Scaffold this active site. Structure first.
Site, PDB file in Angstrom:
ATOM      1  N   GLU A  59       0.848  -1.190   0.000  1.00 33.32           N
ATOM      2  CA  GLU A  59       0.000   0.000   0.000  1.00 33.32           C
ATOM      3  C   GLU A  59       0.885   1.241   0.000  1.00 33.32           C
ATOM      4  O   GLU A  59       0.723   2.109  -0.861  1.00 33.32           O
ATOM      5  CB  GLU A  59      -0.975   0.006   1.184  1.00 33.32           C
ATOM      6  N   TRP A  81      -8.544  -1.795  -1.783  1.00 34.91           N
ATOM      7  CA  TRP A  81      -9.378  -0.817  -2.493  1.00 34.91           C
ATOM      8  C   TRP A  81     -10.178  -1.410  -3.651  1.00 34.91           C
ATOM      9  O   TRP A  81     -10.803  -0.665  -4.399  1.00 34.91           O
ATOM     10  CB  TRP A  81      -8.530   0.340  -3.044  1.00 34.91           C
ATOM     11  N   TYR A 125      -4.175   9.392  -1.667  1.00 33.96           N
ATOM     12  CA  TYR A 125      -2.814   9.719  -1.200  1.00 33.96           C
ATOM     13  C   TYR A 125      -1.763   9.783  -2.302  1.00 33.96           C
ATOM     14  O   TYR A 125      -1.094  10.804  -2.456  1.00 33.96           O
ATOM     15  CB  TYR A 125      -2.361   8.741  -0.100  1.00 33.96           C
ATOM     16  N   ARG A 158       9.883  23.419   7.150  1.00 36.64           N
ATOM     17  CA  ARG A 158       8.800  23.392   6.163  1.00 36.64           C
ATOM     18  C   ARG A 158       8.710  22.085   5.360  1.00 36.64           C
ATOM     19  O   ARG A 158       8.115  22.053   4.284  1.00 36.64           O
ATOM     20  CB  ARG A 158       8.899  24.595   5.210  1.00 36.64           C
ATOM     21  N   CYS A 177      -7.930  10.177   6.080  1.00 39.43           N
ATOM     22  CA  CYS A 177      -7.716  10.075   7.530  1.00 39.43           C
ATOM     23  C   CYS A 177      -6.331  10.626   7.925  1.00 39.43           C
ATOM     24  O   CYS A 177      -6.163  11.212   8.994  1.00 39.43           O
ATOM     25  CB  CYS A 177      -7.916   8.621   8.019  1.00 39.43           C
ATOM     26  N   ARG A 197      -6.582  12.816  11.607  1.00 39.28           N
ATOM     27  CA  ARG A 197      -7.813  13.448  12.115  1.00 39.28           C
ATOM     28  C   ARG A 197      -8.824  12.457  12.687  1.00 39.28           C
ATOM     29  O   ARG A 197      -9.725  12.851  13.436  1.00 39.28           O
ATOM     30  CB  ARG A 197      -8.492  14.276  11.017  1.00 39.28           C
ATOM     31  N   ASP A 200      -9.243   4.575  13.714  1.00 38.53           N
ATOM     32  CA  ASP A 200      -9.747   3.304  14.236  1.00 38.53           C
ATOM     33  C   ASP A 200      -8.659   2.707  15.116  1.00 38.53           C
ATOM     34  O   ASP A 200      -7.636   2.219  14.609  1.00 38.53           O
ATOM     35  CB  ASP A 200     -10.089   2.344  13.088  1.00 38.53           C
TER      36      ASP A 200
END
Ligand SMILES: Nc1nc(=O)c2c([nH]1)N=C[C@H](CNc1ccc(C(=O)N[C@@H](CCC(=O)O)C(=O)O)cc1)N2CO
Lengths: 290, 315
Positions: A59, A81, A125, A158, A177, A197, A200
């Site tokens: 992944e 997915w 992503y 940065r 997420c 944010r 699980d």
């Protein structure tokens, strides 16, 4: 520290706030949590329960090359997915057991242009890390850029990748997420803090820790640096009510040593064969509803 | 509690390795930190040193109304963003005073240069205040906080009012895990005077209480963090007022938390001081929207701090 993950699960059990959503799903949650992983002490795959490394690395690998097509995942036995992509096929034009899933997976794997129209996932992503669309129709490659910056300006405050775009979120099915992450370099060592944010805590978080620890290692190797810390910062941390027994079971087991990550002597040419874990000896899998 | 912040500064003094920063000042630094403030226990305006709240609210209101020109701030005697604007002007083709290269450091070492700066700065401010053409071109910091919160620009010719959306999401969807406002727009960063230091924030709801968490990528611990804490505490209260909730916690998460090498004695003197109770925040009950609040609508009472501890801003 693995005990830092176990303390969080325990704290959700002790003092988490119960909520029932519109649909009858129940969670216990807290808001504002941080846990550190010193990557020199061991690779933070959980020993309290078995965590399959294959799917995490395929992944991550898929994110890293900017791929948004599932063919790459299918080729490596990763079915994460491939629900959404199948759904998209059965309410499309060209179409008790469902062995039609099999013919779909196979066509994606064995066809030229078929995999382009039915295997593409658009905006996640990989595309947010490598290909952030600008107004004039140009594209920003945030990951590659942050890499170059590490090489030539280590002290930069940065070193930032964002996955959160307020224009795209309300129309996408699964808003990220993993909201953003920041790299940091001191004394020849690379660290990464990740803001998540929504988490699980039984099923997701263990996946998430190994994934971003692996990411840190890969960027470290790419930049010729040693590994520092992985700092995992949480927003909404939630334990599903049907994950309680499984958490209690996990807390009753004793922590073993984290295993060792081994990487083959650019990480954009790495495949599955180039990433191994040594001395993984966890307690048996703990099953749970999704 | 204040102790959370005080403890952070001590830990940097004790453990923070030295780092060559962008400003050339030099810093001691840690990566990865979190602090919790229970707003029900008082409004977190630091007591171990005097913090100017007048300036906190100025800067907040200026953010809320979507403004990225410094003009608004100078009408209200707030000069904390002057240097980044002034820098842009002295680099421009329209500057014809004495050379100002690295003015941030040379003022600390050279009293002759410190008076030249002082006067070139006094005339920049007068010009921004009275000349609207000058103001438009040299008051401007680019798409920083205000422009991302209220006017994040879309690809198809429009803008997302990011802050307003999230407030209304608190009212109808209080259990949402997407109560997020981001100031990090990759497209606008390189035209920003500075990319956002307090980068991204989130909201949460339980039992009628509203909590906020901030991710701050880069944290000036002596001079900036006490501003940022009070800034987000105040914001959380405004949103609680509007949405009819009590206040919960403010959670401050940091990336690069740093002490500027010329901030150490300041932090030391600060740590030698006994903490006093936090003050209490007072909002005008008649106001209904976050965006309806003006200066005289926001006050702080029983603020009784130790004295001002002066320090140089890293430019
Ligand atoms: N180096 C640096 N650190 C920061 O924290 C920072 C920055 N630059 N550039 C932009 C914003 C601006 N914030 C600032 C906050 C406080 C002060 C300051 O000097 N406060 C003083 C003076 C008060 C007064 O004028 O009376 C103080 O004593 O508190 C300056 C800039 N910012 C932070 O986001």
């Amino acid at each position: 520290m693995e005990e830092a993950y176990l303390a969080l699960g325990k704290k959700i059990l002790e003092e988490g706030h119960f909520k029932e959503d519109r649909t009858g799903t129940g969670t216990y949650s807290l808001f504002g949590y941080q846990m550190r992983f010193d990557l020199a002490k061991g690779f933070p795959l959980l020993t309290t329960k078995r965590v399959p490394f294959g799917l995490i690395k395929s992944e991550l690998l898929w994110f890293l090359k900017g791929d948004t097509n599932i063919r790459y995942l299918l080729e490596r036995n990763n079915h994460i997915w491939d629900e959404w992509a199948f759904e998209r096929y059965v309410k499309s034009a060209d179409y008790q057991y469902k062995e039609e899933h099999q013919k779909f997976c196979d066509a994606i794997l064995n066809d030229a242009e078929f995999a382009e129209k039915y295997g593409e996932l658009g905006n996640i992503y990989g595309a947010q890390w490598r290909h952030w669309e600008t107004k004039d129709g140009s594209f920003i490659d945030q990951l590659a850029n942050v890499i170059e910056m590490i090489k030539t300006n280590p002290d930069s405050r940065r070193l930032i990748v964002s996955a959160w775009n307020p224009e795209d979120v309300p129309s996408m099915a699964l808003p990220p997420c993993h909201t953003m992450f920041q790299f940091y370099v001191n004394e020849g060592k690379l660290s990464c803090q990740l803001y998540q944010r929504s988490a699980d805590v039984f099923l997701g978080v263990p996946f998430n820790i190994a994934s971003y620890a692996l990411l840190t290692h890969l960027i470290a190797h790419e930049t010729g640096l040693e590994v520092g810390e992985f700092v995992h910062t949480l927003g909404d941390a939630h334990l599903y009510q049907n994950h309680v027994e499984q958490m209690q079971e996990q807390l009753s087991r004793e922590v073993r040593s984290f295993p060792t990550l081994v990487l083959n002597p650019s990480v954009f040419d790495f495949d599955m064969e180039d990433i191994k874990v040594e001395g993984y000896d966890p307690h048996p899998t703990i099953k749970a509803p999704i």
